[PDB]
Write an enzyme that holds these catalytic residues in place. Sequence first.
Site: not given
Lengths: 532, 532
Positions: A197, A324, A437
């Site tokens: 990320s 995500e 995520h």
Amino acid sequence: SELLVNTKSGKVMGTRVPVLSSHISAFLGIPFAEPPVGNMRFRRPEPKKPWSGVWNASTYPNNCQQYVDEQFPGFSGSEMWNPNREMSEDCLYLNIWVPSPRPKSTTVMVWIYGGGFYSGSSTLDVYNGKYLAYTEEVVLVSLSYRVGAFGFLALHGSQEAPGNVGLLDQRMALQWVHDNIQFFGGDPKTVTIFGESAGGASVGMHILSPGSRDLFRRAILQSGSPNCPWASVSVAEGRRRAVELGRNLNCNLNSDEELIHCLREKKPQELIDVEWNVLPFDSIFRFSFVPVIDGEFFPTSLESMLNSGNFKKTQILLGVNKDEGSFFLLYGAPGFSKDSESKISREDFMSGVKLSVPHANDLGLDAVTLQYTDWMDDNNGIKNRDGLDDIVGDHNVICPLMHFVNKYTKFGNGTYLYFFNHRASNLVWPEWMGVIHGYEIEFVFGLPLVKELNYTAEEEALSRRIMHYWATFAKTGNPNEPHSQESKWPLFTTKEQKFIDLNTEPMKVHQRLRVQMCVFWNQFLPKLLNAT
Amino acid sequence: SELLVNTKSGKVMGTRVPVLSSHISAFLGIPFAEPPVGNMRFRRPEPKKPWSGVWNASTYPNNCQQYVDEQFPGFSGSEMWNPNREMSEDCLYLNIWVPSPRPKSTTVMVWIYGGGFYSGSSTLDVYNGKYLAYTEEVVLVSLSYRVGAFGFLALHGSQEAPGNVGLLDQRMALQWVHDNIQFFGGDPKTVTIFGESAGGASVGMHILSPGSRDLFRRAILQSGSPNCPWASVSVAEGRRRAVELGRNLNCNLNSDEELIHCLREKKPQELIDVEWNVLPFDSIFRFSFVPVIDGEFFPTSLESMLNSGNFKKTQILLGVNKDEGSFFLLYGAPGFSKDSESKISREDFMSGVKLSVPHANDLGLDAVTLQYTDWMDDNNGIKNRDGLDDIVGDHNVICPLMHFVNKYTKFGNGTYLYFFNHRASNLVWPEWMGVIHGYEIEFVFGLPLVKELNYTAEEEALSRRIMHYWATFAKTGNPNEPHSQESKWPLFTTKEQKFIDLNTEPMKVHQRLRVQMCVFWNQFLPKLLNAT
Ligand SMILES: *[C@@H]1O[C@H](CO)[C@@H](O)[C@H](O)[C@H]1NC(C)=O
Ligand SMILES: *[C@@H]1O[C@H](CO)[C@@H](O)[C@H](O)[C@H]1NC(C)=O
Ligand SMILES: [Xe]
Ligand SMILES: [Xe]
Ligand SMILES: [Xe]
């Protein structure tokens, strides 16, 4: 002693850590910069002055000052991301896991944590490098960097708070690694940066910045890309936010000097307490203090850099997870909760779209709504939930990454792409959130190899598979073993655009990941928004 | 005599025609208006003066002056639509098929031919009403009306060429039917108007126009709707086109009088020879002389009429064919031809989109392109061919009709909708064209009941099925027989939006016909085009 290491900064003494019925050496909490405290707050980092005697590197360091998630107190799903050490502005340390016996000159992997640039820690349990270091015989480094206002407050023009200093913290840690990792048995010529990320975005930013390019060999980007919509802002938006922070703390705003002196006299938590109030829109997946396109770290806009090939040319491995978006909808959108199926109504749906694309006018919201609604069944709570999940993930992670990848591969020397879609057997988050995520990380760091964690055997094998791909790519620039019976992860090319799934099933190769939706997000919607 | 009929206009004498091993009476070429010739060209029609003696109605009348298709000389596929009589400005006649023995007062069906308002004939073989009249025992009427400039030349403000006079020809024929059909055994209280394409649009226009509403009971619309993008123009566009026609024939343009006097002195074919030159864009499925929103025939815009319910409230039956667009792509778009599979390249594709939506800016063309491309296989010639086919059909026929239907049903007293997707076994057009614009007509008129035509038995049964639905709806306002074993054509409602397929397979009921694409065409694209 295996645990004693003399560096160009001074001697360090580590500690023996057991791992999988064996042991390795760990050098924890090594300083790579001077404490960015006092009048140094918001400034570019300074190299750590060398020390006499022996630095005790037997325990983890402090974590940087950051927002702390209290949304689900006591819940492991969220607290596993919270700082597990005392927080402090004195937090610029790095950690090294070294095989026993000490290598002579082997592959080096450097991990850059994620957290939306407002948070993160190098010390989390899911980031323990000993399994990876031990199982793949790499020297494993994790760095740290300032987050939130402390790291990304930007008043372009000034030298007291220029912005991007968190990125410069990463760079400084990469410099120390370059200069000293040989003493730990690492090959500074064969250093792979990897992150997830905001960490994966960071990785890509170091690929772009002429100033970091030389400090590493290849790169791995997990669920993130330098051009993500949340990963950077203009110098003008950066300063608006800084001034607005000043406004929330009753600062003198007559000038940068006044503003900055006010913010340096505040306690860390006073800054953090008002951080979220400076966002320009009611939104999700948007963070207050992030990198700035300043014309120095980033000489020009990213698109301009990517289009012209103004970037490091090398190999990359990268990919995304299947769901995500779910994390951000749970925390911020209406209709979503931890203990329900989160079946979503049309009303909530369209309110989620508005939150997910805060910068769009009504016509664009319409465009989004149209692409993700099934008009033969527009009231299906589950279809609505799932379409919003794809919206958030497509717009904020997958499609920006796909654009980066296609732009990159034209000039790079090798691309490998994946799609991670395994829902772990022991997930504590609800099933509607799917493959979330951040939940590929525990596989990349080898946690399923640990019996008491409760993964299945398939999951341990998957982990082992993923670690060997990453470490092998790190060493040679290709995740595949040349002399191997196992199936081949094909190269991503401009032409064919192939990628693999990552899960406990036999490898399947696909092409043009989410191409239908990413043409919408990378070509049509931006054109619409400019023409309207 | 069965063949002798006294009307309010005078006596008429018909002819006995054999049909399916039997016979019926036919009254062909009955005048309902004065010849709109000379100084009457472009004028509103005048009622025919009554006559002494007996009008010979034993042969078909002349067809109106029109463009003639020579694209495929000698090919039955196209010539079957060409006028099969001498063309003449003296063409305002109607035809009646009456069961033997003469009914007392039965269901009346009145057919309005299609042809883009530039063409058509009441006398075509595919429009022979004897099978229908005979098989369903209805009095079958076909009318005629001026097409092209002769019928739709519009100089708003003047009374010499006010526009819409072709529509008024239809209306005048509907008036004569209302007043006289009782003498042929028809019930003027139970008159159903039906037509295809421009004929179906016309039908819907008579539903809207306060002036026609009272002249009929219910309506059938085949592959056409009053609000189709090609079926009307503004008074300002109508006059631009008229002036441009004048420009192509070296007319004096100082005023309407000058222009009009010039055009009335031209031979018909001189007008027809330049007709296509007045279109504002390079386009397909666009016709030069069409109805005009004049504030009289149409008191306000159609959307305004439909939204407020300003229209005849009754029952309607209507529907579309599966490949409405193919005819227009063959004749006009690049890449398409009669004797190939017409596999279409990306270049040709996007050039087809531009032609298909001539009024859109580039952003909208983009929007269209995006909705109809498969981005996982954008070079597939067959997918490209088929997507363009859907584009043309969706934008010009299906989606406008779906909008009409949803708007109508809110206020109407009953809607029945269908989707015709049978490819006739004896089609002479290539298979890529599929189920073509106009090829449901031969089933509605019962041609498969005729052995030498070479249809299968399934096709004859399908025909018989369709005729009985139409005639039954005409009689009662419902295509279904109440006391019937056969499966039920459900009512279209706002809520459920059900429709049936029409083919040789067992009835299957569906919902929300092409709703995904029609939301694009009826809601999003128009919003885009206005905002940009
Ligand atoms: C990478 O670079 C080497 C050396 O220039 C070249 O021979 C090779 O083909 C390149 N590999 C790719 C995937 O471009
Ligand atoms: C049609 O009108 C009749 C009489 O007003 C009414 O009773 C009937 O319910 C209506 N049918 C539909 C489908 O609306
Ligand atoms: Xe992964
Ligand atoms: Xe769109
Ligand atoms: Xe039909």
